[PDB]
Amino acid sequence: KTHVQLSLPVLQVRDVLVRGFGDSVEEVLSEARQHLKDGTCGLVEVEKGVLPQLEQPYVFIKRSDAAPHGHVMVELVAELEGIQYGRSGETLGVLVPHVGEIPVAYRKVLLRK
Numbered sequence: 001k002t003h004v005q006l007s008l009p010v011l012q013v014r015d016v017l018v019r020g021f022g023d024s025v026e027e028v029l030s031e032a033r034q035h036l037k038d039g040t041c042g043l044v045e046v047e048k049g050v051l052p053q054l055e056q057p058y059v060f061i062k063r064s065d066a067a068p069h070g071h072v073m074v075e076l077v078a079e080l081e082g083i084q085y086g087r088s089g090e091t092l093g094v095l096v097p098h099v100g101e102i103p104v105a106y107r108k109v110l111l112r113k
């Protein structure tokens with residue numbers, strides 16, 4: 001399928017134990033996709049002071065369109081040193097590995113895969 005319905009755990013930035021997916025734009029997009037498929041991906045909502053507490057390159061989920069079955073349609077955009085790889089809509093947040101942190105909420109998305 002071109003899209004997959006996911007329910008992503010929303011994590012507090014200070015709880016996140018593994019604060020990025022890797023060291024290059026291509027690696028972080030690859031790892032983010034693998035973690036989304038394996039159900040081991042969390043979401044941090046971006047507010048003042050969040051991104052400096054996480055590791056670059058960043059992987060964002062961004063709105064790709066305007067929401068089936070309650071799931072907002074999203075795609076992945078990576079960011080390194082102020083340059084973005086991909087073009088999309090409003091940031092829903094930053095993806096990180098999930099290693100069992102307790103979420104504050106779940107965010108339903110339809111991921112372009």
Ligand SMILES: NCCc1ccc(O)c(I)c1
Pocket residue numbers: 001004006033034036037038111113
């Ligand atoms: N064709 C790969 C299957 C798959 C399932 C769920 C996902 O979240 C993702 I990304 C890929």
